[PDB]
Enzyme design. Sequence first.
Site, short mmCIF file in Angstrom:
data_model
loop_
_atom_site.label_atom_id
_atom_site.label_comp_id
_atom_site.label_asym_id
_atom_site.label_seq_id
_atom_site.Cartn_x
_atom_site.Cartn_y
_atom_site.Cartn_z
N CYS A 35 0.82 -1.21 0.00
CA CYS A 35 0.00 0.00 0.00
C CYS A 35 0.86 1.26 0.00
CB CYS A 35 -0.95 0.01 1.18
SG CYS A 35 -2.01 1.47 1.20
N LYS A 62 -10.81 -8.43 4.92
CA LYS A 62 -10.67 -7.61 6.13
C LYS A 62 -11.33 -8.18 7.37
CE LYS A 62 -10.38 -3.34 3.48
NZ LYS A 62 -11.03 -2.04 3.22
#
Lengths: 244, 244
Positions: A35, A62
């Site tokens: 990321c 997630k």
Amino acid sequence: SNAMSGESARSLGKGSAPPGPVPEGSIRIYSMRFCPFAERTRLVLKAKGIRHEVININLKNKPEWFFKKNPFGLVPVLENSQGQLIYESAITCEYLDEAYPGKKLLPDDPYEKACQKMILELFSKVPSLVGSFIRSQNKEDYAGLKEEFRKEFTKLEEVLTNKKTTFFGGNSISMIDYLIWPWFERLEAMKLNECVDHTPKLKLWMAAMKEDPTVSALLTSEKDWQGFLELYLQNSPEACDYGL
Amino acid sequence: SNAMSGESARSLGKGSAPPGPVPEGSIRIYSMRFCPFAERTRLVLKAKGIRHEVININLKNKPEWFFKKNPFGLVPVLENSQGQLIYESAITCEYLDEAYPGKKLLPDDPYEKACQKMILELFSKVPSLVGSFIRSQNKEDYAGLKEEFRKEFTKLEEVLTNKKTTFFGGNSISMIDYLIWPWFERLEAMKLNECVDHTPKLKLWMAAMKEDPTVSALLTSEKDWQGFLELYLQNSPEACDYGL
């Protein structure tokens, strides 16, 4: 190679238990190895020599407890021993520069600090352009996006030209350089080297950033990144752990 | 009524005479009387008691010279006697709080300061919903947008609940309240007052804000706002000067 940050940490997905409290004297970062937004925070932690631990989040699987860390459910998120939570990459970076000693990354001068934040807004179109480029389904869209990159990169070239300095905030590397660097880090991997061939100051800046010890310490395989990228676009729960 | 924040200044459009130099000891704000983003900056200038001059820009007949004040061509823009230019409403507000004496609007604590910026991000969807709402032409789309307002207002009500405070940064007014106030200020004019009825603390915060001397001094006619809005939606060059 010596593993830095959380380069070897397997990500936490659905069914993982919420991690335990953060040890006193340490700060935790909830991140993802590939990321660019979380990389800004890891660069600041390294540059300031802050003792920290990394927990990687599987962004394609997630854990529900992650939404308690950040209601937006995005990395980076900082968590300290007092249980204080800080999210939004730019807010996480400014918080660390303010709350910890070591190299001062943002200027104190109100106007100079405002300039770094205005340069950040001049850069704002690049992340979505990077996004459109990676999802490009044909040669027509692909070619046009390269021209868009050149147009946005020219705005940054203009800042360097006017400042007459190597970095976006002066003679030395400062906050703003670390904030924009994770997108330029991947230009070669994305086969976008041609997009800086009419921005000579930005090309010299990229070379100077690659030599910074903090920047250099966080570099990873271009192939782990392309491999990750392929799986991320397929919404794979294995994407975030590619290379591990 | 008494004008103390550019309420009487006719806007500058294409062909209009640009302003003179900024006097030493004063700061200029390029604004627009009904722009909620430029209003954040006007609230900060008034609250801190900063000497300033307001120049209104005709957003629907923009002078080309204005793009040299801000390459984005948006208000607010700050300009001092030294010729420094600051744009982006949140950047203009933080700059004024740091550069000038008077009442301190942002907290000294790094975490408390980070909280103000995370709350601004939790509010960040409200301006776009307001945009869509004012453009709505279907009963189904009208009702649907109101349910989204209710959901965004619930996120703000949760902050007030968790904090146990009257305002978003404590038991007294601070930067964050002024940053989000311009949108709530207009809910009654948009016939959306009932959207806050399910968020009691948020409704009480709105009442409390209405009584702040800074907020009260910048009070405008609900009908001037509505009349401006009809003309703005028609891209009229007469919109920004409505009521003058």
